[PDB]
Write a protein that binds this ligand. Structure first.
Ligand SMILES: [Mg+2]
Ligand SMILES: [Mg+2]
Ligand SMILES: [Mg+2]
Ligand SMILES: [Mg+2]
Ligand SMILES: [Mg+2]
Ligand SMILES: [Mg+2]
Ligand SMILES: [Mg+2]
Ligand SMILES: [Mg+2]
Ligand SMILES: [Mg+2]
Ligand SMILES: [Mg+2]
Ligand SMILES: [Mg+2]
Ligand SMILES: [Mg+2]
Ligand SMILES: [Zn+2]
Ligand SMILES: [Zn+2]
Lengths: 386, 94, 131, 150, 136, 87
RNA sequence: GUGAACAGCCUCUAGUUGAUAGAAUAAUGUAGAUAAGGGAAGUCGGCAAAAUAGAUCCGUAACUUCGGGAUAAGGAUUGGC
RNA sequence: GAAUGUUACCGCAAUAGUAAUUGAACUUAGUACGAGAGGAACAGUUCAUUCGGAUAAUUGGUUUUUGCGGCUGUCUGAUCAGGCAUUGCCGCGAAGCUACCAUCCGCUGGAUUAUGGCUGAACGCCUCUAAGUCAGAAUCCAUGCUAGAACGCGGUGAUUUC
RNA sequence: UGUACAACGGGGUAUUGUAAGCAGUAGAGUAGCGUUACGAUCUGCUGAGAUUAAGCCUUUGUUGUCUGAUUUGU
């Protein structure tokens, strides 16, 4: 008979199965639709999540109760040194779907990206792409033929890039390699662009800019095996119920004589792939800017890195992206930043961000000081300093 | 409201509150006032004749620098002797 | 964090502040108003037997007398001896509103302090006479 | 946007940090930290807690009255915006901070004078009081030097 | 946001679920107020309706005039002990929970409010703002 | 309320989208593309300065390795009867 | 020794050091705890926990077989020198 | 997780699942409409409810960091430094975890239902229907989102001297 | 056999709240002859001292380490 009181089900059936993601780098499942008359452009970028901090924004939002008023907001900092273009892949349309027809690599690759092709790098003879690089000799036949094949048959063109992980504070030396779709001119112009950009760097400010909505694709933080109460958000059973209260009391009271797929069960929590959308870029910071932590209202010459560095990350010494709010993944995880799949019609996508202040107090405690000069000036002369 | 209706309408038009400022120079209207400088609020230092007050403070500083406000041996002991005593005391404590 | 501190100094179990009690004792009119209160049914002792220093009602005059003869009351009396520690002290220790804080200290030492001391002397001798 | 000082320890209170308590007489108590807020709730005395600026000024650990400490005060009468006046104020703030730091250092130096004299007297008394240990030290010195010689 | 309220209301931490007793901050003769319903409350199984500062509730007088007693009336929450975030950048709280008696249009029954009134409630309700002596 | 998939709201959105929002998207695209070109030119100039210090038919097989591999694979599929398109 | 105390806690004489181990620190348990704001809205039912607690002084109703009820209830206090 | 040369990197997408919801507010406006009393909506904007997915800058909770300090009783002659009290107890406490007790984010193309039509017979009138055809619901199928067939597949690197 | 790796050390960044030792003429008083003796506590040297990656950041120092096992072919 019918359930007496209505309640919505616990959890979302479209995020199934709640299994560990197959890779630590979450896949981009859809790129923006290509417009051929537009100039050539990358559709995505790769970065590393460094941490969070706090800002003060001078908000312009007509019709809002906080119009012409200051708001304090959380932001996420992503460390984004330039990526290095190393290859190009062509894709053809078939009745079974998109098929990669051919791949062309650049003549010279760094050991940073060569490490991605090894499980035991220190023992290997490092022979990867050595015979391939010999195909660039004597007027480059083979290379030219495969570029001609891409031009003649490809309906989609993607470019193989990799991170420069040696510019981050990470202990990992092996770089991250990814395909990034080229949306822009014709197929021929896409291929010419890729061939021209082989072994060259693309910086994040030649892909994004401030006041733009982007999407964050990443694997969430893992939490191991989890019970139903916290994995699914179900209600705890009364105190000292026999055989536990972090359970669902009845997993089936009705006919099918099985456990339904729609019933909450204990299992893996976290380390899933997620694509969150519409995060506004608050700042595109440059790595050689001495005051990239400073605003027009705060005249302190300071960088973005908080005192003592980001906890478990280190210091920001490269270009960075500051997006408001939070993104999937924990600090130092590789994240993919994607351009919007559609033209956002909300006015927040039109707002221009004007930051009044960026928090650089220490995250390793209840940080009270923004700079070491400020801490020293407030405290005064110490016993060791005399 | 006519300006608003021709620009964006209600809830889309963003009015500039600085346009009615009565300042000495009209180019100063769209100027950002700084608020923080190295842990200090600019507003509670902002004052007319702060330049004269700073000058008086500097005269005080010069008077101290002339007076000598900013500027190993004992009776019965030389420098090597006090060093020897210090080393022996450190040895004893250790 | 601990249970003792939580259940004693929970916000819903807060007590009157020392600067407020200092202001209560500073003026004679406040002293007389707090000494002579209307018969209130919801206060202990029908609103009578009120110690101003501790901001506390007692059920009876004998309870008030035994309270005045105690280390708790003497502790509160010692606490109310100095400057009442406004936000001006913290601002001045930071180096801000220094002239304002110094003027306030001068006023306490010159006028408000000795008047409070005289009121406290008169209040103590009245409590001795009536108790 | 304004930097406040903690009601308990006078530390700077930046936006977002700490917590504010409003008393029924409309007085705001801003606290930089949970530590200071819990001390206030337990009703501890900031002038007796040694880690606070109120105590340090009360006990004379740092100079409290100086001509550099009078420039910063809450301005309740505004002045019209002037670009060059703002520029002069910004230069003056750095100059005042530099002079205040120099005078703070000098104050700590004057407070700590006599330390070397005390240390030397203590060392002399200890050396005078330990003749046997010094003899052991000399034997160790002579044996180590003879080992180096041979 | 309630009838008589002026504009939208952004989310505030909830401090007063049904069954709470707050003080009466006006001068209409009531001493405390017992919350029995919250206007604008949503619906979810097992979840208690709760009120924050600037909300309208239905309340009974437990202590005060017998004329005020045995009647269910609207009240507007002007103070709460649960800390809440201000968008300027501070979490804050009051000493007590407090409300004032109103009619369904949000007009004040009493003539004055003793103690501070939260800015959010004052800005939401113009009659509370008119009867307020202290706005934080 | 109107759902996210409500026709009249989506029609109003499309009318709004064809105008000022698409204008903003296009202008940002032009700015970013100019920055990308300048980035390439700057890399060329740096490499040039550094080197100053130092000084088509697609028919047939892709290569002989590809020829041997695909021929062997197709022969193996014929022999083991594992072809998707041939018997 | 503490303390009213053959209580609990720590120690001297004497006596043991036995009870399968090692490494890890998911869920669910068993045993024990803490929690903002609210304060029984939970539940068949305040079940369970929490709150109280030693001693000194002030004070203590109905009812009553006049013996009680009574540690009724309600208050002030407690270190060290 | 065996096996279809070995080993490695980048990918495709059959199939299965799928997700958002509701209320108010400004403007339209004191307008249409109305003797009056009253009193809308589309287009343009701003918040919130329920749900969902993350997240930890900040606030709060938590403490074997037994990190720092203190307290009772006893024991180590005292000081010092410590032990025990089934984590002894009290205050603070980073890190980690975590809360509508904290913050962020959650869309747009095709085909349709009722119904309103166009052209038009049946039936020399007529008729949205018979043939043909236009719109149109929170619906359907997709776009987007999750997994990826361990017996679905593609592209690419290296491929062994006792 | 190297922006190599590690163990320590250094510097930051955080946490607590002023170490041990010595001194004073600060200390309710009491005992003996203005003085000495006991004396909770207070003050100074001293934001001192302790801790700080175990899932914090960093590093021109010191000392070491870089080595075995097994299997795979169109
Ligand atoms: Mg932190
Ligand atoms: Mg229920
Ligand atoms: Mg609680
Ligand atoms: Mg009930
Ligand atoms: Mg019930
Ligand atoms: Mg009884
Ligand atoms: Mg499908
Ligand atoms: Mg509309
Ligand atoms: Mg959650
Ligand atoms: Mg002990
Ligand atoms: Mg017709
Ligand atoms: Mg597979
Ligand atoms: Zn008292
Ligand atoms: Zn503080």
């Amino acid at each position: 008979s019918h359930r007496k009181y209505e309640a919505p089900r616990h959890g979302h059936l479209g995020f199934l199965p709640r299994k560990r993601a197959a890779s630590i780098r979450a896949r981009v499942k859809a790129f923006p639709k290509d417009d051929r008359s537009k100039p050539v452009a990358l559709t995505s970028f790769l970065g590393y999540k460094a941490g969070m901090t706090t800002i003060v924004r001078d908000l312009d939002r007509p019709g809002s109760k906080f119009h012409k008023r200051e708001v304090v907001e959380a932001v996420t900092v992503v460390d984004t040194p330039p990526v290095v273009v190393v290859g190009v892949v062509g894709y053809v349309e078939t009745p079974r779907g998109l098929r990669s027809l051919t791949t062309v690599w650049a003549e010279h690759l760094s050991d940073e990206v060569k490490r991605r092709f090894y499980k035991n790098w220190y023992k290997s003879k490092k022979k990867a792409f050595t015979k391939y690089s010999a195909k660039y000799a004597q007027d480059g036949a083979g290379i030219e033929r495969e570029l001609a094949r891409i031009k003649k048959y490809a309906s989609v063109v993607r470019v193989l890039v990799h991170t420069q992980i040696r510019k981050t504070p990470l202990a990992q030396k092996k770089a991250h390699l990814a395909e990034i779709q080229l949306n822009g001119g014709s197929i021929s112009e896409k291929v010419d662009w890729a061939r021209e950009h082989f072994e060259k760097t693309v910086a994040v400010d030649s892909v994004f800019e401030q006041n733009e909505m982007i999407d964050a694709i990443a694997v969430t933080k893992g939490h191991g095996f989890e019970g139903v109460t916290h994995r699914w958000g179900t209600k705890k059973l009364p105190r000292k119920t026999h055989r536990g209260l972090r359970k669902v009391a009845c997993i089936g009271a009705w006919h099918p004589a099985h456990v339904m797929w729609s019933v909450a069960r204990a299992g893996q929590r976290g380390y899933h792939s997620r694509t969150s959308i519409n995060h506004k870029i608050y700042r595109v910071g440059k790595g050689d800017d001495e005051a990239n932590g400073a605003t027009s209202f705060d005249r302190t010459k300071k960088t973005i890195t908080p005192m003592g560095g980001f906890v478990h990350y280190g210091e920001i010494k490269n270009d960075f992206i500051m997006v408001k709010g939070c993104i999937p993944g924990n600090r130092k995880r590789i994240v993919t930043l994607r351009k919007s799949l559609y033209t956002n019609t909300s006015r927040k996508a039109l707002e221009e961000v004007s930051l009044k202040w960026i928090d650089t107090a220490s995250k390793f405690g209840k940080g009270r000081f923004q700079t070491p000069a400020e801490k020293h000036a407030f405290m005064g002369t110490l016993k060791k300093d005399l | 409201r006519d300006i608003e209706a021709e620009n964006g309408g209600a809830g889309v038009f963003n009015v500039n509150l600085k346009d009615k400022y009565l300042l000495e120079d009209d180019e100063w209207k769209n100027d950002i006032m700084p608020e923080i400088l190295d842990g200090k609020n600019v507003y509670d230092f902002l004052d007319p004749e702060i330049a004269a007050k700073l000058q008086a403070l500097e005269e005080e500083e010069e008077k101290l620098e002339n007076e000598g406000f900013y500027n190993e041996i004992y009776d019965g002991f030389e420098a090597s002797e006090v060093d020897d005593i210090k080393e022996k005391a450190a040895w004893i404590r250790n | 964090m601990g249970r003792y501190s939580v259940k004693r100094y929970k916000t819903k179990r807060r007590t009157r502040d020392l600067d407020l009690i200092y202001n209560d004792l500073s003026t004679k009119e406040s002293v007389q108003k707090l000494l002579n209160q209307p018969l209130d049914e919801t206060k202990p002792g029908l609103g009578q037997h009120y110690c101003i220093h501790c901001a506390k009602y007692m059920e009876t005059a004998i309870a008030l007398k035994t309270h005045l003869k105690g280390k708790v009351h003497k502790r509160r009396v010692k606490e109310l001896r100095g400057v009442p520690y406004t936000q001006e002290v913290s601002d001045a220790a930071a180096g801000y509103n220094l002239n304002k804080f110094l003027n306030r200290v001068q006023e306490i030492t010159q006028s408000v302090g000795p008047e409070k001391e005289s009121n406290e002397a008169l209040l103590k001798e009245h409590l001795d006479s009536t108790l | 946007m304004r930097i406040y000082q903690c009601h308990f320890c006078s530390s700077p209170c930046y936006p977002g940090h700490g917590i504010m308590f409003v008393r029924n007489d409309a007085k705001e108590f801003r606290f930089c930290r949970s530590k200071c807020h819990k001390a206030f709730k337990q009703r501890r005395n900031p002038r007796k807690l040694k880690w606070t600026k109120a105590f340090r000024k009360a006990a004379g650990k740092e100079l409290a009255v100086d001509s550099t400490l009078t420039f910063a005060q809450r301005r309740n009468v505004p002045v019209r915006y002037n670009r060059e006046l703002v520029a002069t104020t910004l230069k003056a703030m750095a100059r005042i901070e530099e002079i205040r730091q120099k005078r703070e250092r000098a104050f700590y130096k004057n407070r700590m004078r006599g330390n070397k004299e005390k240390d030397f007297l203590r060392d002399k008394k200890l050396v005078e009081s330990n003749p046997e240990l010094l003899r052991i030290r000399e034997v160790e010195i002579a044996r180590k030097l003879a080992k180096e010689q041979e | 946001s309630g009838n008589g309220a002026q504009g939208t209301k952004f989310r505030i931490s909830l401090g007063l679920p049904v069954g709470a007793i707050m003080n009466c901050a006006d001068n209409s003769g009531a001493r405390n107020l017992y919350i029995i319903a919250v206007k604008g409350s949503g619906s979810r199984l097992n979840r208690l309706p709760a009120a924050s500062l600037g909300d309208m509730v239905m309340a009974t007088v437990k202590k005060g005039k017998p004329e005020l007693r045995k009647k269910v009336m609207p009240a507007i929450v002007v103070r709460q002990a649960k800390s809440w975030r201000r968008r300027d950048g501070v979490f804050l709280y009051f000493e007590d929970n407090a409300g004032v008696i109103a009619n369904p249009k949000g007009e004040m029954k009493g003539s004055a409010i003793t103690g501070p009134v939260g800015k959010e409630c004052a800005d939401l309700w113009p009659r509370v703002a008119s009867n307020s002596g202290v706005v934080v | 309320a109107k759902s996210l998939r409500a026709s009249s709201h989506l029609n109003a959105k499309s009318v709004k989208r064809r105008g000022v929002f698409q204008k903003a998207v296009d202008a940002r695209e032009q700015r970013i593309s100019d920055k990308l070109k300048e980035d390439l030119l700057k890399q060329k100039l740096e490499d040039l300065k550094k080197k100053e210090e130092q000084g088509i038919s697609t028919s047939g097989w892709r290569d002989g390795r590809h020829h041997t591999y695909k021929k062997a694979k197709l022969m193996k599929q014929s022999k083991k009867k594992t072809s998707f398109t041939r018997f």
